[PDB]
Design a protein around this ligand. Structure first.
Ligand code: MG
Ligand code: MG
Lengths: 238, 234
């Protein structure tokens, strides 16, 4: 779709800039530059669309019902440290519903896209959540915010825990079937918006920690395939 | 340029690497074995008398052995998480003198030789110059008391699922330190030298030198390592 292509292009241009800055305060700069590039691209492409970008005053668009939701650099600490795991995330929200999302890991050149009703793609092939049915078989990703109890709970149950230091990339990974599930607390809307669509379009399910749909409100998330998501929920509550 | 045996190990790593990336894009076992045979054949053809301790062979030359993890990060590899590596160390008279860790996916080549420095893609590695845990990203692998103690002190914890690569990252200064329990000699052998050659230190969790017997480790620049040692003891 036309808007998807604009989103992808913005993300890739931001991505190239990131890789270039990754090459070399300077992290804030890299983040700010990626953001400028995305804003410029998406503004030029959709001048009446709103913008919700990480830690930045929301721009209400002339077209009040469409806004891009952006994390120009997801995995900032990874980025600061030289850990080649971070991503650009752009979601499009239309009428309060996420309808398109791009997560781009510019180091591995890994493009995750989904549009509502179209499925999720990992570089132009359909990707799907994993088919695992038991936690014992699972690699679950997580991020730092009771957390220790949850961690203990899940650690007891799973084959392995990953903590990559990204949110959006982590969701892309569940959506691509690379990890079997994800949970995190204190996540922002831009951390999650494209990833949640990705997971759902990949045939997974995404709830808040309490198993509902107040993700953006509760700032927390459990994602995985239907089976893993429920058991994760169970494990987390124990 | 790189020494004769380093060049050999790098080649074996590059080649096991290239193969794993192919097997990447029971199946996990075959890849592991394939990488291993590639490494084995490559290093056999290069130093026929050397020992091999792989994830044992005692060679005609009792003073030298290769310590090999043909695929570190097996679970990642199975799951398609692009974070795994080949690890080859050379041990001479009980001392790790050469080491290679190769992440074939990112094409990240880590090399060190005793007295010659650690390198990441032709760049000299230096462990990070961080001194406060608060500014630190610490890597670990699969006690919750110890994780809490560390986690409450640091800016971040990472669990990427690859011990050799985690040590290589410590050495390159990508993370500020690393600790793990129940680690194998092949997991640690090349990594320990990198960190050392990058100016960091390696101890067992107790703070002593019995890493291979304890099968545990804390790695980092000393300021960070001691702080981790403290945090793991509380
Ligand atoms: Mg960000
Ligand atoms: Mg292995």
């Amino acid at each position: 779709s036309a808007v998807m292509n604009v989103m992808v292009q913005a993300a890739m241009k931001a991505g190239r800039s990131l890789v270039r800055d990754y090459g070399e305060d300077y992290v804030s700069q890299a983040d700010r530059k990626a953001e400028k590039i995305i804003f410029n691209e998406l503004s030029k492409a959709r001048p009446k669309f709103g913008f919700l970008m990480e830690e930045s005053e929301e721009i209400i668009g002339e077209d009040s019902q469409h806004r891009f939701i952006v994390d120009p650099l997801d995995g900032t600490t990874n980025f600061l440290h030289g850990i080649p795991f971070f991503a650009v995330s752009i979601a499009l929200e239309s009428q309060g519903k996420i309808v398109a999302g791009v997560i781009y890991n510019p180091i591995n050149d890994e493009l995750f896209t989904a549009e509502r009703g179209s499925g999720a793609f990992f570089n132009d092939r359909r990707c799907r959540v994993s088919a695992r049915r038991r936690l014992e078989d699972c690699v679950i990703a997580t991020g730092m915010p009771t957390y220790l109890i949850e961690l203990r709970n899940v650690m007891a149950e799973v084959s392995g825990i990953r903590r990559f230091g990204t949110a959006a990339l982590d969701l892309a990974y569940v959506a691509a079937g690379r990890t079997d599930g994800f949970w995190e607390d204190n996540l922002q809307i831009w951390d999650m918006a494209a990833g949640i669509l990705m997971v759902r379009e990949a045939g997974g399910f995404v709830t808040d920690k309490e198993g509902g749909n107040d993700i953006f409100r509760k700032k927390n998330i459990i994602a995985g395939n239907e089976h893993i998501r429920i058991k994760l929920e169970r494990a987390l509550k124990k």
